[PDB]
Design a protein around this ligand. Structure first.
Ligand SMILES: C[C@]12CC[C@@H]3c4ccc(O)cc4CC[C@H]3[C@@H]1C/C(=C\c1ccccc1)C2=O
Ligand SMILES: C[C@]12CC[C@@H]3c4ccc(O)cc4CC[C@H]3[C@@H]1C/C(=C\c1ccccc1)C2=O
Lengths: 231, 10, 237, 10
């Protein structure tokens, strides 16, 4: 497997290059709350397509069986969207940057029943990243980790790759000048945030199901099949 | 079968 | 504000001394098994463990320094996570089996409904710990991390949040201290540290599913749920 | 008020 033979710099560069683009929402005001769920789900559906091409570019992911790739993406796709959302919301405190033309605040969450809670949690994660001064290089490592880790205990190469990324994360902190103590502390802080992103994703799937069962908000077959995988 | 299968192979 | 003044070894011994006991179930190999009765055994056990967990939480360094309201929130978020990691820890030397209690050891031919996926996930976690050769000293660290971490991002004067993070950092130090003491290289320590914390994501995931099933069990109104369990469950909804 | 509250308070 080519992944394990990469240096830390080579790992980073390969991950930055694989970064999916920032998509835009549909244009045109106050949000209905089926208008808003439409926009979001439509955005999530188009992002999923780019996520699948990003995933194939994550070192070591191509070395997996198609079925193992399917499983990891099905398990982690909402987490991966969320950490993306949280990431590009960093420089917008109090705001969630779903798209450059779709910046939402907690207030607009109330439109959808039980959307305020995730808004708060997502906002919490964002400010946390902000106050941690999360670098883009650390972010792409964290997002890769989610992809490989989240579905792994629902199935050995993967763990070797996970170590590789850990090596890269530590390598990135040492270069930033952090002391030894500060390095493992920051590593720990980052990885603990992944438990919360997992938590947010699980609450997320719950609402998607009940939104599907209502059939008021249009969901793409792709989104539906991703949703089905969690049941 | 699965949309995800097609997208991963393309 | 003691917790921040403890050396790594004093941290460990303190945590080791606070360890709750292994309780017994009321399992009778006389009595014929059923989905309802077996589930009642598990929820009964869980309820009794909860009482010990609450008093174990008070002995976790830094925890008592928190407001009562914050203590309540942290336990409500983390209790099932803590039960689950306790389960998979004492199940380590029983490959393919989950030691809920010394007299209740399940291979997950149990059967009962909707619980298959987890015995598998709990077994995977348990076996994972076994391959890593997790130590008791590392275990009590992980458990304390879950207590303080699982509820931190749903909890404004904010320095209770900072104090908790300061305690978490201190526990991170204690984990590395142990791994270095075990002869691991620097690279090895970071890797092991990461591997351990990533498993906490799966435990979070298992717990989330846990609360889901517990809700359905409540609404199906067959398996008896204690008042404390129902209150914790209401906390999550 | 909560059981958890009282036990913790004890
Ligand atoms: C899944 C989601 C809609 C799509 C959202 C999304 C879209 C694009 C993107 O880049 C990121 C995200 C993150 C959040 C996703 C929404 C979560 C959600 C419902 C929900 C409700 C309560 C609690 C958590 C999630 C939803 O309904
Ligand atoms: C909550 C649980 C019953 C109690 C179990 C338990 C009891 C004692 C203990 O020390 C640990 C545990 C951990 C697991 C607990 C069971 C989880 C569960 C249902 C369930 C179903 C699917 C997925 C996750 C959880 C259950 O119904």
């Amino acid at each position: 497997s080519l992944a394990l033979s990469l240096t830390a710099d080579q790992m980073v560069s390969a991950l930055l290059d694989a970064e999916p683009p920032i998509l835009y929402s549909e244009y045109d005001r106050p949000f209905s709350e089926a208008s808003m769920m439409g926009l979001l789900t439509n955005l999530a559906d188009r992002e999923l397509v780019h996520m699948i091409n990003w995933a194939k570019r994550v070192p070591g992911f191509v070395d997996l069986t198609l079925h193992d790739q399917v499983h990891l993406l099905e398990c982690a796709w909402l987490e991966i969207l969320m950490i993306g959302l949280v990431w590009r919301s960093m420089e917008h405190p109090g705001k969630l940057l779903f798209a450059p033309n779709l910046l939402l605040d907690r207030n607009q969450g109330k439109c959808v029943e039980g959307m305020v809670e995730i808004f708060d949690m997502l906002l919490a994660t964002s400010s946390r990243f902000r106050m941690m001064n999360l670098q883009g290089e650390e972010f792409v490592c964290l997002k890769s980790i989610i992809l490989l880790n989240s579905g792994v205990y629902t199935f050995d190469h993967i763990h070797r790759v996970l170590d590789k990324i850990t090596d890269t994360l530590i390598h990135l902190m040492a270069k930033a000048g952090l002391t030894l103590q500060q390095q493992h502390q920051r590593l720990a802080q980052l990885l603990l945030i992944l438990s919360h992103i997992r938590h947010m994703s699980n609450k997320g799937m719950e609402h998607l199901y009940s939104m599907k069962c209502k059939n008021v908000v249009p969901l793409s077959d792709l989104l539906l099949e991703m949703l089905d995988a969690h049941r | 079968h699965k949309i995800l299968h097609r997208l991963l192979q393309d």
